Design a protein around this nucleic acid. Sequence first.
RNA 1: AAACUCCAGUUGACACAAAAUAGACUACGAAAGUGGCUUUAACAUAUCUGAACACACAAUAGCUAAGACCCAAACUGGGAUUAGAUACCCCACUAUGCUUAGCCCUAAACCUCAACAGUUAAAUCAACAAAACUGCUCGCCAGAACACUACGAGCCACAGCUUAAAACUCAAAG
Lengths: 48, 122, 72, 74, 23, 97, 137, 128, 86
Amino acid sequence: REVLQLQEEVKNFITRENLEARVEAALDSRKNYNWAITREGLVVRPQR
Amino acid sequence: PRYELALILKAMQRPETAATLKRTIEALMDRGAIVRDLENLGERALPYRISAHSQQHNRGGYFLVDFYAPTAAVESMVEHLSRDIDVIRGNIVKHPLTQELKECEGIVPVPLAEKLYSTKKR
Amino acid sequence: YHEDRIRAKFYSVYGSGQRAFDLFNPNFKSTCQRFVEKYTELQKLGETDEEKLFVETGKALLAEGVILRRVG
Amino acid sequence: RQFSYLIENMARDCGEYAHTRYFRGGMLTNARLLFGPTVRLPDLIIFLHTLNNIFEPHVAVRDAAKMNIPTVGI
Amino acid sequence: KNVLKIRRRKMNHHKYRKLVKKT
Amino acid sequence: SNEDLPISMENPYKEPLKKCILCGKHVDYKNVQLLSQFVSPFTGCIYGRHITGLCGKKQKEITKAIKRAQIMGFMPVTYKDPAYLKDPKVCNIRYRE
Amino acid sequence: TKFSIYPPIPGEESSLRWAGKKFEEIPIAHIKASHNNTQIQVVSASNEPLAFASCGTEGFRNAKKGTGIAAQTAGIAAAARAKQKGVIHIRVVVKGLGPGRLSAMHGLIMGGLEVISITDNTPIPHXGCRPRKARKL
Amino acid sequence: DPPPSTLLKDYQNVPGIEKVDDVVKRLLSLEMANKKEMLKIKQEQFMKKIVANPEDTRSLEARIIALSVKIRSYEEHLEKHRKDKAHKRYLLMSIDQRKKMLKNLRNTNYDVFEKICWGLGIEYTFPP
Amino acid sequence: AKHLKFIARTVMVQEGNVESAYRTLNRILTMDGLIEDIKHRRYYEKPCRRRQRESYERCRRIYNMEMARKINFLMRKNRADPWQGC
RNA sequence: AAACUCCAGUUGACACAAAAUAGACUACGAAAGUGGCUUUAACAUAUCUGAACACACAAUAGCUAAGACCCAAACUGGGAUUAGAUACCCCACUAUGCUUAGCCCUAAACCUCAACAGUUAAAUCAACAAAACUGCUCGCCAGAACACUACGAGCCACAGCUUAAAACUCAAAG
Ligand code: FES
Ligand SMILES: [K+]
Ligand SMILES: [Mg+2]
Ligand SMILES: [Mg+2]
Ligand SMILES: [Mg+2]
Ligand SMILES: [Mg+2]
Ligand SMILES: [Mg+2]
Ligand SMILES: [Mg+2]
Ligand SMILES: [Mg+2]
Ligand SMILES: [Mg+2]
Ligand SMILES: [Mg+2]
Ligand SMILES: [Mg+2]
Ligand SMILES: [Mg+2]
Ligand SMILES: [Mg+2]
Ligand SMILES: [Mg+2]
Ligand SMILES: [Mg+2]
Ligand SMILES: [Mg+2]
Ligand SMILES: [Mg+2]
Ligand SMILES: [Mg+2]
């Protein structure tokens, strides 16, 4: 099952052919790893 | 194995930032790497003043690069980053998602230690 | 005892009701104890599962006029 | 101290004795000196509380076994 | 525990290291 | 014999073990907003497990992540980032009074 | 609004203005509270020396410099040389745990200067250089 | 030394891995693994080559093979780290513990003692 | 040096009350440990001596934290004698 | 007091040195020992005990050779104290502490409590300390001092380490 899941993801990996395209797309999006927590153990992601 | 390259580029325009990313990713493939993704964390202000290549930086762009590569390719890649002037700071760490977290049951209370001293009348 | 599992769940689902215990009175029956008698009596019928048997017990008390306010 | 009054009354009603106060050293082992040489010590001691106020055995439990007096205790 | 048995050995070693330096 | 005798059984009323706020969650060195919740607003000093309230296994993860983010250029050392000063307080420490 | 003990951040605009000036434009009073002396130096936001005073420059010598009287006397002399240049509000920056750590701050108030903030810049190394050996006195 | 293209011990057995992408076969090989995955394969070869029942690993024979693969690992680590005194003690103890295994094996089953000495290239030397 | 200035160990004065601010500042440094750390860093504390002090400070905390737990547990019996006279 | 006064303070640039908080945690390693970050390699044995005929390690100090040098610092010098002060206090600076390549192989190297297995009952138990015991094995000790010494032997050790006595003396030592 792990091999099958891996065989699907490999399609999305960057390659020398699509390297330039992926770079431009990355410069347009943003990934946010920031999130706080309360005393009740509840995640609070920022509204941005 | 699977690694993650925390890259801090210099505050540059889009044309120059794309040439550095491509220049940096082509170096990984030349060393036997298999790039997987390119995440952008956005341009922010550095927590402290960083000095690199005779330049005092106050801002930089944060980018992540998840990839697969052999163990011998890490040390050869750490040298390449040092030479690149556009890169303020770059470090490689083992990807945090390849470290399974053992399930936790809860906090176990610890009772006070007993029988530390003889039960004699001092 | 076997009925301690029942009491533990009642207190978790409902908890001690407005009715206050009277420990002086030897032949005193609390709301939870009343719930145990019905829960066990329905067990004699033949039901072999806790979830359904537990749910049916609460309904019987509500029919008898007992007040069962769940913690929720 | 909560039951000192109740016990002192019972002893008086049943024509018996009570000692609910601080037990001075030698009431039993050195009685003849405290009271007199012709004193008569108890033949039976009844402990309604075998502990003192510091959660330790009453000294009379040990002093009674020295004087060969049988004890009854709760 | 006292160090009276250590003080005897302390002077013995000191005088011996001082005698070797002299001879 | 008699049926009223007790039985050999485990405690039914026993309560589940308590958990830290971070139990079952992944601590990553890039989440500076979470890591700043366990440092002094004034000195940047890391708090202890008697202030954070975390367990031993998770207090070690926050520490290793803070020390890694500080030297990588993600988090400051001497002070807490002012941007995260208005975040929920989870630490049991009161300075002003 | 409420009051906060956290200073305004230059990146973020604030509503706290002292005599029509921002928190950043306020001059700074650097105090160096040592065990045997106490130096005071006032500067502007652009790092321009305005006034300098110390327990030694005021006449105190040897052990008499490590007291609160000489520190206060030095704070009054530094607040009288800076008040002639148009200084009213200052930001204090103490460095050291010497005797004249607080007494020097009083002399600044007794010279017509108002303290809006207090900053501690005491140098603590994270390890650093090995200090001198412990004394037997 | 197993080639780098060799698949991992776990993934070689699963069905359907014969026909997959080349990139997926390069991620499941020894090239993208650490040093401890190549040693799991070196041990597998010796068992099939030498031991009658590869599946049984608690037998005295397998323990010798498992330990002889560790000894070779320490010699490759000491050829680059000469001043690592810790791993130099694990080597000298592992060589002494294998000799104690070969002694008990030569005393019980001499037929297999010759097979292991030949397969692994070991020469039992009587102590002085 | 490389960090921003006037953001660390900085306290603002309320209504020109310098004393109350200084007490607050001196209380933040004390709770964080800087004050004591600065006093021990005046002279070099050798490892052997620093290991003797940490062990001393840790055994004192235990004792001081258990006695206080017993004082707050017995403070309930500080009331008047209910059986006055027996 | 001397010293310094091409000194001090603010700001900026700026390490072959040392590694706040976390740590009120008690983990790793045979011990020594190990508490900044990342990566690579990696932490013996499916019964135990077992080498003072061997092998491999072993804090600090120190020797040899070549480098580095912020700070600290034996030695030395100066100032002061003192009856004197070859010390305690102050200043300055050197070997040295660091790196690389070799040697040296010691410690209150002490948690002064050996390894494996097992027990909590009986006489629990001189005292103190960190409760009292069983089985098995190895190592070690037999009054004090002479003696961490002499001779002999071994060692990259040459004012050294290891092993280690005797004569005379005492009726105590502990
Ligand atoms: S309690 Fe489960 S992780 Fe802290
Ligand atoms: K010791
Ligand atoms: Mg003593
Ligand atoms: Mg002598
Ligand atoms: Mg052995
Ligand atoms: Mg030995
Ligand atoms: Mg050594
Ligand atoms: Mg050296
Ligand atoms: Mg110096
Ligand atoms: Mg002199
Ligand atoms: Mg030098
Ligand atoms: Mg040294
Ligand atoms: Mg030691
Ligand atoms: Mg010993
Ligand atoms: Mg042994
Ligand atoms: Mg003798
Ligand atoms: Mg010696
Ligand atoms: Mg000798
Ligand atoms: Mg000789």
